[PDB]
């Protein structure tokens, strides 16, 4: 679920508006034009597409490194 964050007015006839999403996941915030408003209040995405690096944030049990304290090289 997205929420408007920052309200920036372009010098031209444009006011980009910043959006952030409730799950606070891998996703970054986004700049939205008031015209695209009311269209992306909430987003749903399939799993194979998510940002890989910060996908693990959902769960330690997503993936670990079993030594977890490496002794040898």
């Amino acid at each position: 679920h997205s929420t408007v964050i920052a309200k920036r007015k372009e010098d031209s006839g444009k006011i980009k508006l910043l959006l952030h999403w409730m799950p606070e996941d891998i996703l970054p915030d986004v700049w939205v034009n008031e015209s695209e408003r009311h269209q992306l209040k909430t987003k749903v995405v399939h799993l194979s597409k998510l940002p890989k690096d910060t996908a693990l944030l959902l769960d330690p049990n997503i993936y670990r490194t079993m030594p977890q304290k490496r002794l040898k090289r």
Binding site: M66, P67, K69, L71
Partner: protein
Amino acid sequence: NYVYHPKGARIDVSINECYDGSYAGNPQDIHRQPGFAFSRNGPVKRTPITHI
């Protein structure tokens, strides 16, 4: 099981009976006094085996 109901497909499921799922590692760790099992932090020697 495949039943093939006329409507296109039907599968009556049942639980496995044995499903031999048990630890497959150094068969000894199973009995290490707890806290040491699955140490995974030091080489250990064991008997040799080979499968195909």
